């Protein structure tokens, strides 16, 4: 917020992967009658 805010992009992405993946997984899995396992 004051400095080295660039690294934040590397840290946020390092998690957004395991996050967005799960989020979209649960949603699609609950929205789709034939989830993909």
Curated annotation (Swiss-Prot):
It is found in: Endoplasmic reticulum; Endoplasmic reticulum membrane. Pfam families: Ost4 (PF10215). InterPro entries: Oligosaccaryltransferase, OST4, Ost4p_sf. It comes from the Eukaryota. GO terms for cellular component: endoplasmic reticulum membrane; oligosaccharyltransferase complex; oligosaccharyltransferase complex A; oligosaccharyltransferase complex B. One of its GO terms (biological process) is protein N-linked glycosylation via asparagine. Keywords: Endoplasmic reticulum, Membrane, Signal-anchor, Transmembrane, Transmembrane helix. Pathway: Protein modification; protein glycosylation. Component of the oligosaccharyltransferase (OST) complex. OST exists in two different complex forms which contain common core subunits RPN1, RPN2, OST48, OST4, DAD1 and TMEM258, either STT3A or STT3B as catalytic subunits, and form-specific accessory subunits. STT3A complex assembly occurs through the formation of 3 subcomplexes. Subcomplex 1 contains RPN1 and TMEM258, subcomplex 2 contains the STT3A-specific subunits STT3A, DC2/OSTC, and KCP2 as well as the core subunit OST4, and subcomplex 3 contains RPN2, DAD1, and OST48. This is Dolichyl-diphosphooligosaccharide--protein glycosyltransferase subunit 4. It comes from Homo sapiens (Human).
